Enzyme design. Structure first.
Site, PDB file in Angstrom:
ATOM      1  N   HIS A 159     -33.780 -79.687-100.563  1.00  0.00           N
ATOM      2  CA  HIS A 159     -33.598 -79.792-102.038  1.00  0.00           C
ATOM      3  C   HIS A 159     -34.895 -79.655-102.822  1.00  0.00           C
ATOM      4  O   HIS A 159     -34.923 -79.888-104.030  1.00  0.00           O
ATOM      5  CB  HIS A 159     -32.798 -81.029-102.417  1.00  0.00           C
ATOM      6  N   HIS A 212     -25.929 -74.795 -93.421  1.00  0.00           N
ATOM      7  CA  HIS A 212     -24.540 -74.973 -93.066  1.00  0.00           C
ATOM      8  C   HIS A 212     -24.159 -74.403 -91.703  1.00  0.00           C
ATOM      9  O   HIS A 212     -23.245 -74.916 -91.039  1.00  0.00           O
ATOM     10  CB  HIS A 212     -23.692 -74.433 -94.213  1.00  0.00           C
TER      11      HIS A 212
HETATM   12  C1  HEM Z   1     -26.960 -85.489 -97.180  1.00  0.00           C
HETATM   13  C2  HEM Z   1     -27.086 -84.205 -96.866  1.00  0.00           C
HETATM   14  C3  HEM Z   1     -26.795 -83.178 -97.916  1.00  0.00           C
HETATM   15  C4  HEM Z   1     -25.917 -83.123 -98.918  1.00  0.00           C
HETATM   16  C5  HEM Z   1     -24.805 -84.116 -99.224  1.00  0.00           C
HETATM   17  C6  HEM Z   1     -26.114 -81.856 -99.537  1.00  0.00           C
HETATM   18  C7  HEM Z   1     -25.360 -81.368-100.644  1.00  0.00           C
HETATM   19  C8  HEM Z   1     -25.590 -80.184-101.248  1.00  0.00           C
HETATM   20  C9  HEM Z   1     -24.735 -79.640-102.212  1.00  0.00           C
HETATM   21  C10 HEM Z   1     -23.512 -80.355-102.781  1.00  0.00           C
HETATM   22  C11 HEM Z   1     -25.251 -78.461-102.648  1.00  0.00           C
HETATM   23  C12 HEM Z   1     -24.644 -77.615-103.787  1.00  0.00           C
HETATM   24  C13 HEM Z   1     -23.756 -76.472-103.311  1.00  0.00           C
HETATM   25  C14 HEM Z   1     -23.491 -75.599-104.517  1.00  0.00           C
HETATM   26  O1  HEM Z   1     -22.794 -76.107-105.441  1.00  0.00           O
HETATM   27  O2  HEM Z   1     -23.938 -74.441-104.628  1.00  0.00           O
HETATM   28  C15 HEM Z   1     -26.435 -78.244-101.906  1.00  0.00           C
HETATM   29  C16 HEM Z   1     -27.308 -77.210-102.082  1.00  0.00           C
HETATM   30  C17 HEM Z   1     -28.341 -76.930-101.218  1.00  0.00           C
HETATM   31  N1  HEM Z   1     -28.763 -77.703-100.173  1.00  0.00           N
HETATM   32 FE1  HEM Z   1     -28.038 -79.428 -99.645  1.00  0.00          FE
HETATM   33  N2  HEM Z   1     -27.200 -81.217 -99.014  1.00  0.00           N
HETATM   34  C18 HEM Z   1     -27.552 -81.903 -97.914  1.00  0.00           C
HETATM   35  C19 HEM Z   1     -28.571 -81.551 -97.090  1.00  0.00           C
HETATM   36  C20 HEM Z   1     -29.296 -80.393 -97.056  1.00  0.00           C
HETATM   37  C21 HEM Z   1     -30.178 -79.983 -96.005  1.00  0.00           C
HETATM   38  C22 HEM Z   1     -30.454 -80.653 -94.657  1.00  0.00           C
HETATM   39  C23 HEM Z   1     -30.682 -78.779 -96.364  1.00  0.00           C
HETATM   40  C24 HEM Z   1     -31.652 -77.885 -95.749  1.00  0.00           C
HETATM   41  C25 HEM Z   1     -32.651 -78.236 -94.957  1.00  0.00           C
HETATM   42  C26 HEM Z   1     -30.121 -78.388 -97.651  1.00  0.00           C
HETATM   43  C27 HEM Z   1     -30.508 -77.308 -98.460  1.00  0.00           C
HETATM   44  C28 HEM Z   1     -29.766 -77.024 -99.656  1.00  0.00           C
HETATM   45  C29 HEM Z   1     -30.149 -75.892-100.514  1.00  0.00           C
HETATM   46  C30 HEM Z   1     -31.308 -74.999-100.274  1.00  0.00           C
HETATM   47  C31 HEM Z   1     -29.271 -75.892-101.502  1.00  0.00           C
HETATM   48  C32 HEM Z   1     -29.289 -74.864-102.682  1.00  0.00           C
HETATM   49  C33 HEM Z   1     -28.404 -73.715-102.625  1.00  0.00           C
HETATM   50  C34 HEM Z   1     -28.570 -72.643-103.706  1.00  0.00           C
HETATM   51  O3  HEM Z   1     -29.665 -72.593-104.258  1.00  0.00           O
HETATM   52  O4  HEM Z   1     -27.535 -71.847-103.929  1.00  0.00           O
HETATM   53  N3  HEM Z   1     -29.353 -79.470 -98.095  1.00  0.00           N
HETATM   54  N4  HEM Z   1     -26.683 -79.335-101.068  1.00  0.00           N
END
Ligand code: HEM
Ligand code: HEM
Ligand SMILES: [Cl-]
Ligand SMILES: [Cl-]
Ligand code: NA
Ligand code: NA
EC number: 1.11.1.21
Lengths: 713, 713
Positions: free
Chosen positions: B244, B77
């Protein structure tokens, strides 16, 4: 574009503390305006101004051939925004050339006046500020027309951005009272810190209160607003009658012909506004207030005709060509000249607010005395004009140039001359050691010097520790200054002073004003010692002691701190949150956000709070100068909740155990909340920051001690 | 409290140019973050970060015992706000800790993550910035979980106030498209410079476009937003699937349980927000986005399970416990671990936007290749992670510490090393004299150097005259750069360069990049001579020439100036007034209001306008370096009106005769209209200002010439 202010309109605003940076200032970091002005040929400037008075420009023709009235109005409005409550407004920063003042309705067509002055400003450049020039022009107008002024001081440096001043909450120019954002309540009580009856006016409505043309009721508004601008009845009558000895008002046609104010006008208008569709739009056809009044038979010469008319005729209500209420002497001959047509003359006319000078019983006595004794009128007006146009300039030491009046006036909160050798570094060391040996504590020493110094406000440059007025009425009895504790400190200091002074050779002595500040310096050094650090706090001698007879007690009242976040002090319950009042105080003290943050965190642990309150004292080593406030504030091991008893007092408890560790106020905890202030707290709360914290604390403590030291400028 | 913004919401705002003053900065004026970081023990910090990963705090318990997913999201972010259109946003200033980003809905609970890092920040103090720390923590999270990163550079200095970025015009968080302030029009065309689909999101809506769960249409939004963040399809798939691979989403209960965002929360919240009333409010009961998805069987370890699941199952639409649209694997066993209860398992789940990686035909090809060749996935993700988190850091010369990747990447707009002696002062004098002897004019020389240097933007530190990219595609063909005139200048300079270089001893040679800038310096010198003034313009050699292959033409397109007030240039008709576009360009050039003013007035009279336009050329001595622009702009003898043909071009006519004197655009005339800018113009337009004007002009000219010179940092 949506902004943080849109999303979070009640978050605290720190941008007031970073106005006036080097980034917005076109002059180099070393430019010194006093140096430039001191070398100005003032007499040459005044000769150019004199010529200007009768050199009409076709784009704003001069009434009667003479711009003197327009320029006196300009300069009274430059000065006339001043409020004693906070010291904000006034002429001393040349704010009339910026928003919003450049576009206030009561400032209509003063854009023209300012433009008439550009050639002169351009010719002399940085050697005469706009701020100085606006006042000087008013003086030359007076002089050109036969009035002897009391004098003039230069030294108002130009500013480069608008000040942030609370001018009211109305969202409508000139809104009549009683609206959703009314500045009145109760029995016509005007809210502090305001000093005008409507948004966009200097003092009062010239038709009468909320447009009701009753001279008697209008006099109440006049008295209240002028008192809020530091003028008494005598000064008020002298100023209004003096001013309306000259020129004329402008109301030739309907106000609807008048277009957008400067800030709203198109770019082609080039900084001017209120373009009018009425006939020629100017000159004989001018519309400014919408009133159409000419007071005297010689609107371009000093006279005593304003009172001759006021008392010599009976008045009847009428309307100007724009529909505004005003008065006329129907039994009079047509004796008043026309501004443009030599073949026309007019009857005497008056505003409702002029007739207040005759129909209010207190004013009538003064007006009658001035009528019968016009030399007394002239002297009172010259003195009040000087006071008006200098009230926000600060100590006399700031006054520059060849025309400064030698007479010292009680309003200037005067400081006696120093006529003797000052203490040196060795003597200062000797005194610090005596102070610490007397048994006065770090808390006592720091609190006393804070109380003395932190009356300064940069808005009008009143206050500060010079004069030792903390020992006088009324400062010695202010609740914030802890009258009984202060009296015991000062007794001890006075004994030290008398002993030191008595042992000296050759004229050397120290003032109590200096010793109070030096003693606080010793407290700060001792607190550093208590934390294991040797530091020397800087100290500049040369303050002098003022007497009670040199101290106007009524005028000092507005400097009383009723909110002082630096001492965790609030005198009563206010609608404005305490954190807002803290940033306001910081602004008055000329502090930046980082300086505010370091200073407050250090004062907390030095024991500066009023009443010995434990609020914000986040240390187990009180009276030691450490960064404990920040370290403990930011510890995520402590959880904070508001108290049942007082929602503005908070308990910090260990997150695991529930044990009570600390208590704090909104002023304390805002440092842990506000995202900008917490970033600052984090710097001072880091493990690498003990030396930074000490050094930055000493520097801001010294800045505060020296705020009124324009003798060292 | 009524403000100027209230009364005049459309007046131009200069406060963006005086953000980040020394007033708001707690660090001393000489503090050098690069020097502090170079002395940090980076390995010690990373050991602390590794320990933190599994040190769960009860106030925000770690999912699966391991904060690694939370911290990767936090770092993504931090970086994910970046927009190529203007270079604004990104991780490079640590803005996530200030408004509004600290309180964006998509940043929910990242306030927790940041607070988990306070002990580390505090421990290392000023030697690691928050900005560097957020990224470093992401890297450690990846490393801790078994993923080898590509490297890490420090050097992102902290900032102390919010940046002024246009993030949209919506007045409602998360407002869907087609509202009164829609960021979409046409066929789902997102307004530049925005790079997200809704106000308060990083890129896209994880439910699908405007909440419609169509993976195919979601893919279009992903592709468009990620391209607006400088990422292609390969990078995009690698980043989403890489991310993810770790952690989980949080949607345990209804979103109505979640309270005020940080900037709206009570003071007792101490900088945190989104407090939840759902059960414990945390950990197993956490609510962040409202989705409840866990992607892999090992959420705390690098794996190839994301693509195994994506392709291994067919997906069914369902709802989270908060009502959000998400997907669940048809027929699957409960194979996904629970974050807190060892006895629970869950079926595989996916977001809409994960399914885009399989159902968009372009992405499917890539995902399948990554599925079948996971070493290709791992390398692409490492490279994309590095690019994501460094794309705004600027030239490689900025990169600090022991973990900087040696490989030079196309995206960094690389500059070849200098491997030869540089020209000295004698050689610069020789070359300036050859430049002036060639017949190139002052206008040609100044225009060329301006065009080469003024590509820089400090938002992402791309652009500037280093690299001589003005001679390459696409810069050599930009309309603003006057391609045919440019080609002639560069032909002449290239011959000067080849002659000089051929005559040299040893390895000495000059780059075309340096010569372009040095040639502009000579033009300024000449212009000063033309005005009768002896001036020396500083010049620092050391630029090198980049190749075409080192210059990605597509990525460079976002640097093209479509509006450049300093050349009186506007490519097309825009909704935003041209003066607003001038101040935006000033901000990207890192100029203050005074610097913008002086620079524009000097460029006008040196012949820098595109097309030789006479607009704003208020002088009878073009190509001479004087303050004529200011003197003539402020002459009240001239009246300005808009033209009937074009309301954005103005004629200045003699007020008395009607003779045409000048023509100007809004960019020109705003200096005579806006009250703060006209105050600046007045300084430079005064009789005492010619020398000040020259000296301030040369300084700002040199500042612009050196904006990308991080090799001399
Ligand atoms: C289309 C692009 C993306 C969408 C729409 C998206 C959406 C999300 C959302 C909705 C969450 C959940 C937030 C929560 O409720 O705690 C999340 C979690 C996360 N995303 Fe993404 N994401 C995107 C791209 C990315 C990218 C580029 C990365 C990193 C390289 C990333 C790494 C993560 C990680 C590691 C989590 C887990 C957080 C945790 O374990 O508390 N995501 N993502
Ligand atoms: C109760 C206090 C006052 C009221 C309500 C007031 C009201 C006004 C108004 C409505 C005008 C006409 C504006 C125009 O239409 O051009 C004006 C003119 C003027 N006022 Fe006042 N006044 C006040 C006090 C003062 C004071 C204290 C001074 C100076 C010491 C001053 C000096 C003048 C002058 C010289 C003009 C004439 C401008 C010209 O000739 O263009 N007035 N006043
Ligand atoms: Cl003010
Ligand atoms: Cl930004
Ligand atoms: Na003031
Ligand atoms: Na950026």
């Amino acid at each position: 574009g949506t902004s943080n202010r849109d999303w979070w309109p009640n978050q605290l605003d720190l941008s007031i503390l970073h106005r006036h940076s080097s980034l917005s200032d076109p002059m180099g970091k070393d430019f010194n305006y006093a140096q430039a002005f001191e070398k100005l040929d003032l007499a040459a400037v005044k000769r150019d101004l004199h010529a200007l008075m009768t050199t009409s420009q076709d784009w704003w023709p001069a009434d009667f051939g003479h711009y003197g009235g327009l320029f006196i109005r300009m300069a009274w409005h430059s000065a006339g925004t001043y409020r004693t409550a906070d010291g904000r407004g006034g002429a001393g920063e040349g704010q009339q050339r910026f928003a919003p003042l450049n576009s206030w309705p009561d400032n209509a067509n003063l854009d023209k006046a300012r433009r008439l002055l550009w050639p002169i400003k351009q010719k002399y450049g940085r050697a005469i500020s706009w701020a100085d020039l606006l006042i000087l022009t008013g003086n030359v107008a007076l002089e050109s027309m036969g009035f002897k002024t009391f004098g003039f001081a230069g030294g108002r440096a130009d500013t480069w951005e608008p000040e942030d001043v609370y001018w009211g909450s109305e969202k409508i120019w000139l809104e009549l009272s009683g609206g959703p954002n009314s500045r009145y309540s109760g029995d016509r009580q005007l809210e502090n810190p305001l000093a005008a009856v409507q948004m966009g006016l200097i003092y009062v409505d010239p038709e009468g209160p909320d447009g009701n043309p009753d001279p008697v009721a209008a006099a109440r508004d006049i008295r209240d607003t002028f008192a809020r601008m530091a003028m008494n009845d005598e000064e008020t009558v002298a100023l209004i009658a003096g001013g309306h000895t000259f020129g004329k008002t402008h109301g030739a046609g309907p106000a609807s012909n008048v277009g957008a104010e400067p800030e709203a006008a198109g770019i082609e208008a080039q900084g001017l506004g209120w373009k009018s569709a009425y006939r020629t739009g100017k000159g004989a056809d001018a519309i400014t207030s919408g009133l159409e009044v000419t007071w005297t038979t010689t609107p371009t010469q000093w006279s005593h005709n304003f009172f001759e008319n006021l008392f010599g005729y009976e008045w009847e209500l009428t309307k100007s060509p724009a529909g505004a209420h005003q008065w006329v002497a129907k039994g009079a001959d047509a004796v008043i000249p026309d501004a443009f047509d030599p073949s026309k003359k007019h009857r005497p006319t008056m505003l409702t607010t002029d007739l207040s000078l005759r129909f209010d019983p207190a004013y009538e006595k003064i007006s009658r005395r001035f009528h019968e004794n016009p030399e007394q009128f002239a002297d009172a007006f010259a003195r009040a004009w000087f006071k008006l146009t200098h009230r926000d300039m600060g100590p006399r030491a700031r006054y520059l140039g060849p025309e400064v009046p030698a007479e010292v006036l009680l309003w200037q909160d005067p400081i006696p001359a120093v006529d003797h050798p000052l203490i040196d570094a060795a003597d200062a060391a000797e005194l610090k050691a005596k102070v610490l040996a007397s048994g006065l504590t770090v808390s006592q020493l720091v609190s006393t010097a804070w109380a003395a110094a932190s009356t300064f406000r940069g808005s009008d440059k009143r206050g500060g520790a010079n004069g030792a007025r903390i020992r006088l009425a009324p400062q010695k009895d202010w609740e914030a200054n802890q009258p009984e504790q202060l009296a015991a400190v000062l007794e001890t200091l006075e004994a030290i002073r008398t002993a030191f002074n008595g042992a000296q050779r050759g004229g050397k002595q120290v003032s109590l004003a200096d010793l109070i500040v030096l003693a606080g310096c010793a407290g700060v050094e001792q607190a550093a010692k208590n934390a294991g650090h040797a530091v020397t706090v800087p100290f500049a001698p040369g303050r002098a002691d003022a007497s009670q007879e040199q101290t106007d007690v009524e005028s000092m009242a507005v400097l009383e701190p009723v909110a002082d976040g630096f001492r965790n002090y609030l005198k009563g319950k206010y609608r404005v949150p305490a954190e807002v009042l803290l940033v306001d105080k910081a602004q008055l003290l000329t502090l930046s956000a980082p300086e505010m943050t370091v200073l407050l965190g250090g004062l907390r642990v030095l024991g500066a709070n009023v009443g010995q309150s434990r609020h914000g004292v986040f240390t187990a080593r009180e009276q030691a100068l450490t960064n404990d406030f920040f370290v403990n504030l930011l510890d995520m091991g402590t959880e904070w909740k508001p108290t049942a008893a007082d929602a503005d007092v908070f308990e910090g408890r260990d997150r695991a155990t529930g044990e009570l560790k600390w208590t704090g106020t909104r002023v304390d905890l805002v440092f842990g909340s506000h995202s900008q202030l917490r970033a600052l707290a984090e710097v001072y709360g880091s493990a690498d920051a003990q030396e930074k914290f000490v050094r930055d604390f000493v520097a801001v403590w010294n800045k505060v001690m020296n705020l009124d030291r324009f003798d060292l400028a």
